[PDB]
Amino acid sequence: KLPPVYPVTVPFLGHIVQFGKNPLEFMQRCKRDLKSGVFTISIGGQRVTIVGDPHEHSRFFSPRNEILSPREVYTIMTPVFGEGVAYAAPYPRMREQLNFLAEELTIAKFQNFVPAIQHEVRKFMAENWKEDEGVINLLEDCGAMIINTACQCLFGEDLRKRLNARHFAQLLSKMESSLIPAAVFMPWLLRLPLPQSARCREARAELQKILGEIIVAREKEETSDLLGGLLKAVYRDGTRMSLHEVCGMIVAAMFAGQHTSTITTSWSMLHLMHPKNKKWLDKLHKEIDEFPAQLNYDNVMDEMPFAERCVRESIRRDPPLLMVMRMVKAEVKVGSYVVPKGDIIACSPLLSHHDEEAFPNPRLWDPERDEKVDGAFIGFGAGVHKCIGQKFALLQVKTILATAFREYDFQLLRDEVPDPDYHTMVVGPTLNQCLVKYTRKK
Amino acid sequence: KLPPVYPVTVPFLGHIVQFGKNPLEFMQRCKRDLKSGVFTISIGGQRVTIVGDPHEHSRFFSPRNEILSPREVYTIMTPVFGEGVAYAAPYPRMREQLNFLAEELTIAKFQNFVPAIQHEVRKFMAENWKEDEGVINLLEDCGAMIINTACQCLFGEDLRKRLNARHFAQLLSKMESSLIPAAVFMPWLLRLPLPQSARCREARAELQKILGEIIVAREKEEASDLLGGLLKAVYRDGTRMSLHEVCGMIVAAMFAGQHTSTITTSWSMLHLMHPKNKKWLDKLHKEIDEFPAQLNYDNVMDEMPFAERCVRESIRRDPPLLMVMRMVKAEVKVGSYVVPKGDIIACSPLLSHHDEEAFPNPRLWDPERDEKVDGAFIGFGAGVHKCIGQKFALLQVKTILATAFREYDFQLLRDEVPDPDYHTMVVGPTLNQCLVKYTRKK
Ligand code: HEM
Ligand code: HEM
Ligand SMILES: O=C(N[C@H](Cc1c[nH]c2ccccc12)C(=O)Nc1ccncc1)c1ccc(-c2cc(F)ccc2F)cc1F
Ligand SMILES: O=C(N[C@H](Cc1c[nH]c2ccccc12)C(=O)Nc1ccncc1)c1ccc(-c2cc(F)ccc2F)cc1F
Structure with missing residues (x-):
């Protein structure tokens, strides 16, 4: 009573070599040659049992945290959100913080957004695409737009003044470098020591300070943005969130968006211009x-x-x-x-x-x-x-x-839509293939 | 016939903990408790035999690459020198390129270099060592001198204009930032996906881009420095290096020298001023x-x-x-x-x-x-x-x-010469401990 296991060769490595190179071909091969959309593969020591039987999706998704914990897996983020935040936090608290983030993310908040976005995009567009025509790397140019867009939407003029879009992005990279997506099956990897950590922490710590001062001054002035929204939150304890926690939550939200949304906007344009x-x-x-x-x-x-x-x-x-x-x-x-x-x-x-x-x-x-x-x-x-x-x-x-x-x-500027570049933790069109030429419609 | 095993406290990640924190004392301990120069240890799962017996150095340094292979652990460098360049390349071509480099930094070509050096130092002291006496951190100051003075000897005036030491020391920094040291003992880590983290990318490119422009200007104005020399280098193949290789070679030349050369100037002064x-x-x-x-x-x-x-x-x-x-x-x-x-x-x-x-x-x-x-x-x-x-x-x-x-x-400003800080990959005197006071001769 256990899924078919795709045989290993280089034992201490396991399947990493193949899985690293092209995840899909590999996981497809696995499925085909095992005649099952449910199968187990090995990363280093770690067993990993995959679900590529859509008829089974609920099985993975529906069971309670009691049965399947997303924590031991995503604790690779913990440097980035800080200790006892998110998966670091206990389940109820983890659950609690997540709602707080959702509620600040529900549609209600959006009404102001649509013009806000348009304003930035145009700003970037006129600011960054000034000829009748020219050559840009779409993915790059897109990404800036995404980062600007979010801030316009989620932060307050005050904050923007002490935290310009570009610089927020650099701050975020710095933490990004702290990550080894490898450890998601190999934690002791999490235990290994990295220089990047230092930069991550510096960056992280630094941010808080900017938050602090912004907060404090706002208190004195005594706002409807995400941060402020986050502050007014209260736990089932009835306790307020800490300034560590408010940073971690902001950060998660900032993190999830930057690449993932940016990539999607790019993929979408690449298809439509084809x-x-x-x-x-x-x-x-x-x-x-x-x-x-x-x-x-x-x-x-x-x-x-x-x-x-x-x-x-x-x-x-x-x-x-x-x-x-x-x-x-x-x-x-x-x-x-x-x-x-x-x-x-x-x-x-x-x-x-x-x-x-x-x-x-x-x-x-x-x-x-x-x-x-x-x-x-x-x-x-x-x-x-x-x-x-x-x-x-x-x-x-x-x-x-x-x-x-x-x-x-x-x-x-290519015959074909760029290939996926699978070598990044968030997967996108291949960076060097994303060269596009625009022409001002005007 | 196997070197003996230094026993294993923790199966998952071996000796990387102790070795990491204090390497010398650990290796010595191994060496003693095992009553051998040559002994084996375990990093990740991986066995690591250390030839720690000076009598046997020739047995490690003399076999050819095709026997004891350097590339399979310097893979962490492929993005920095570039694909198919140096360790990326096959061994005979690797050889060719390195010979090209040697032929650049041989005592034959050193004629103009000293005054070049003195100027830069005498230049540097004035910009920072102004007072009849004062306070410095040595390492950061030798850091600057090593890099300033290299670019003087090694790049000619026109390049210097387009790229000055301060800025070039910047680019190197970003690439260096890109490196993960765990990846030497576990280069498979680089197979699985990783955070994007590429200012370096920008960096290599800016450097390459800049050099590229420079070549044209020279070619353009034909109607030399290091860069001059690489541009005349010919393979046994009969070709000459691509910009990509030429560039990757300059990156090699400075990157190699920056920390090592710098640690040594500093370690030496500390010793001598004591x-x-x-x-x-x-x-x-x-x-x-x-x-x-x-x-x-x-x-x-x-x-x-x-x-x-x-x-x-x-x-x-x-x-x-x-x-x-x-x-x-x-x-x-x-x-x-x-x-x-x-x-x-x-x-x-x-x-x-x-x-x-x-x-x-x-x-x-x-x-x-x-x-x-x-x-x-x-x-x-x-x-x-x-x-x-x-x-x-x-x-x-x-x-x-x-x-x-x-x-x-x-x-x-210590009774003792500073300790070595073994936390960086290149190992130098502990940063803070390197504090000094100077006074002009007259
Ligand atoms: C194109 C954009 C995005 C994609 C493709 C994406 C994808 C996903 C996926 C697949 C999950 C499910 C994770 C799981 O079941 O283990 C998820 C959950 C989540 N996403 Fe996103 N996401 C996107 C945007 C965002 C943004 C902007 C945020 C900002 C807050 C965000 C925050 C989260 C959170 C908090 C969860 C749930 C974490 C948990 O419950 O354990 N995502 N996302
Ligand atoms: C204190 C200064 C330096 C020290 C301690 C040092 C140390 C070393 C060592 C130990 C090796 C052999 C490494 C191995 O076995 O893999 C080596 C090789 C090398 N060093 Fe240095 N080095 C120094 C300065 C420089 C400088 C300034 C350059 C400038 C180009 C340079 C370029 C190289 C190159 C190209 C190799 C090639 C090794 C090979 O053939 O694989 N080094 N160095
Ligand atoms: O980057 C990653 N995850 C981060 C961090 C994250 C996890 N839970 C979150 C909840 C909120 C915000 C961020 C996260 C993120 O931003 N994910 C996200 C974004 C939006 N919504 C949900 C999640 C990530 C990417 C790749 C891998 C990975 C590793 C492999 F070996 C092979 C294949 C893989 F795909 C693992 C990863 F952890
Ligand atoms: O940082 C490193 N190497 C870089 C880049 C570089 C690599 N091959 C080169 C050849 C020529 C020029 C530069 C380089 C460099 O600048 N090395 C250099 C400089 C001058 N000469 C020779 C070499 C480096 C330092 C330590 C370790 C290491 C640390 C441990 F704990 C255990 C085992 C190890 F191995 C690994 C490293 F990869």
């Missing part, structure tokens, strides 16, 4: 060219169903997070087989989204397709741990698309 | 006082043996590169032992430089000492891998010493 996709590109202007030159919340939330399909397709074909994963607290039946505690269990957006019985012709970016298995899309995952950023993220992205594609016209 | 060591400091002054202000080539190269001994002794007692290692591609004879393929064979200068037979009372800084086992000293490595920069590196430091001590005196 001549082969021109029909799809046209069926977009059908949707957005009658719009005001000042987009409104409704335009995007309720009046933009096509693009959402695009943005979703992008995320289906090229999920930026290949794996979501848990530790197994107790044996839980999945499919025929049973999984013992001690196993990293893990479900893949990558493997699951390429499932022929669920997404036939999976490398084909067909926006108007739908899953053909129930809950076989998991780009924002599912269950308790379903994304609490998707609405904001999607909103952000749609606004961006409409804005850029209203004024500017783009040509990809 | 109240105890006057005997030598004075002896050096004898050596250094027959000298006109404007030092020349002959002066440093052939009129400074004492200074040279001081410098070697510093390296000897405290080498900046603790350990070098290859990958055992096929078993090798080491003394009574045979070391099986797969192992990371390593040879440690720190360890070697503290073998009691070869250097008596090792922690004592004795410039007039002499290796009582031949070739004990490996601070510049040996055999097929002798450091190709030593002559330049010695000339560089010697000149600084001869320049600095003549117009200054120094005192160190």
Whole structure:
């Protein structure tokens, strides 16, 4: 009573070599040659049992933290959010902090956002794309837009004054370097010592100070932004959040967005500018060219169903997070087989989204397709741990698309849509392939 | 026939804990408790045989690459020198390129360099050492001198304009930041995905980009410096280097020299300024006082043996590169032992430089000492891998010493010469502890 195991050769390594090079081919091979969408592979010592049977998704997603803990797995972030925050925190507290972040992320907050985004994007666009035409690296240029957009939306003029978009980004990288995504199956790796940590901490500590002073002054002035929103939060204890915690929460939110949203906006534009996709590109202007030159919340939330399909397709074909994963607290039946505690269990957006019985012709970016298995899309995952950023993220992205594609016209400098570069922890179009030429529509 | 195993407290990650924190004391302990120079340890899962017996240095330094292989552990450098460049390349081509480099930093070409050096030092002192006396951190100050003076000798005026030492020391920093040291003992870590972390990327590119522009200007204005030399280098193939390689070579030349050369100038001054060591400091002054202000080539190269001994002794007692290692591609004879393929064979200068037979009372800084086992000293490595920069590196430091001590005196704000901080990958005197006060001669 246990899933088929894909045989190992270089024993102390296990499957890392193959899995590192191309995760999909490998996990596909695994599935095919084992004749099961549920299978176990090995990273170093660690057993890892994967779920690429969409018919099984619920099994991974639905069970309680009691049965599968996302903590022992994501404690690789702990340098970045700080001790006793998020997965460091105890379950109830972890759960609690997450709600606080969600509530500051619900639609209600959004009404001001749509113009805010448009303002930044245009600002960047006019500021950074000044000719009738020119050459830009889309992914790079996109990313700045994403970081600017979030801040406009989530921080206050006061904060922006003490924390300019560009510099917030650098701060965030610094922590980023502290991470070894390897340890997610190998913690003692977490135990190894890294120089980066120093920079991460400096950066992290430094930030707080900026927060502090901003906070303190605000108190004296006595605001509706995320931070402020976060402060007013209170636990089931009835205790307020600490300035450590408020930093960690901000940071998580900042972290999740920067790459993942930025990547998706890029993937989406790359597809639409592709001549082969021109029909799809046209069926977009059908949707957005009658719009005001000042987009409104409704335009995007309720009046933009096509693009959402695009943005979703992008995320289906090229999920930026290949794996979501848990530790197994107790044996839980999945499919025929049973999984013992001690196993990293893990479900893949990558493997699951390429499932022929669920997404036939999976490398084909067909926006108007739908899953053909129930809950076989998991780009924002599912269950308790379903994304609490998707609405904001999607909103952000749609606004961006409409804005850029209203004024500017783009040509990809390549025969084909760039390949995925799988060598980063968040997976994106290959950086050097993302050179695009724009032409001012005007 | 196997070197003995130093026993294993923790199976998951071996000795990296102790070795990490204090390497010398650990290796010595191994060496003693095991009653052998040659002994094996466990990092990650991986076996690591250390040839710690100066009598056997030739057995580690003489086999050819295709037997004891350097590349399989310097993979952490591929992004910095670049793909297919240096260790990235195959061994015969690697050879070619390194020979190209050596041919650049050979005593033949050193003519103009000393005045070049003196100028920069005399330049530097004025910009910082203004008062009749004052307070400095040595390491940061030798750090600046080593890098300033390298770019003077090694780059010609036009490059200097487009790229000055302060800025170029910046680029190096970013790339250096990119490195993960755990990756030497576990290079497989680089197979699995990693955070993006590439200012370095920008850095290599900016450097490459800049050089590129420079070549055109020269080519353009034909109607030389180091860069000049690489641009005439021809392979046995008959080709010449790509910009990509040319660039990767300059990155090699500075990167190598910055910390090592710097530690040594600093370690040496600390030793020489120390109240105890006057005997030598004075002896050096004898050596250094027959000298006109404007030092020349002959002066440093052939009129400074004492200074040279001081410098070697510093390296000897405290080498900046603790350990070098290859990958055992096929078993090798080491003394009574045979070391099986797969192992990371390593040879440690720190360890070697503290073998009691070869250097008596090792922690004592004795410039007039002499290796009582031949070739004990490996601070510049040996055999097929002798450091190709030593002559330049010695000339560089010697000149600084001869320049600095003549117009200054120094005192160190501790009873003892600083400790070595073994936490960085290049190992130098503990940063804070290197605090000094100086006074002009007259
Ligand atoms: C394109 C954008 C995004 C993608 C593709 C994405 C993807 C995902 C996925 C797959 C999960 C499920 C994790 C699991 O089940 O283990 C998830 C959860 C989550 N995401 Fe996102 N996400 C995005 C944006 C955001 C943003 C902007 C935030 C900002 C707060 C955010 C915060 C979170 C949080 C807090 C969770 C749940 C953590 C937990 O419950 O353990 N995400 N996201
Ligand atoms: C105190 C100063 C220096 C020390 C202690 C030092 C030390 C060493 C050591 C120990 C090796 C052998 C490493 C091994 O076995 O893998 C070596 C090799 C080398 N060093 Fe240095 N070095 C110094 C300065 C320089 C400088 C200034 C350069 C400038 C280009 C340089 C370039 C090299 C190169 C190219 C090698 C090639 C080794 C090979 O063939 O694989 N070094 N150095
Ligand atoms: O970067 C990663 N995760 C971070 C951090 C994170 C985890 N829980 C979060 C909740 C909120 C915010 C951030 C995080 C993030 O920002 N994830 C995120 C973003 C948005 N929503 C949910 C999650 C990450 C990327 C890759 C891997 C990985 C490693 C492998 F060996 C192989 C394949 C892989 F894919 C592991 C990772 F941990
Ligand atoms: O930082 C390192 N190497 C860089 C870059 C570099 C590598 N190959 C080169 C050849 C020529 C020029 C530069 C380099 C450098 O500048 N080395 C250098 C400089 C001058 N000469 C020779 C070499 C470095 C330092 C320590 C360790 C190490 C530490 C341990 F605990 C145990 C075992 C180890 F091995 C590993 C390292 F990779």
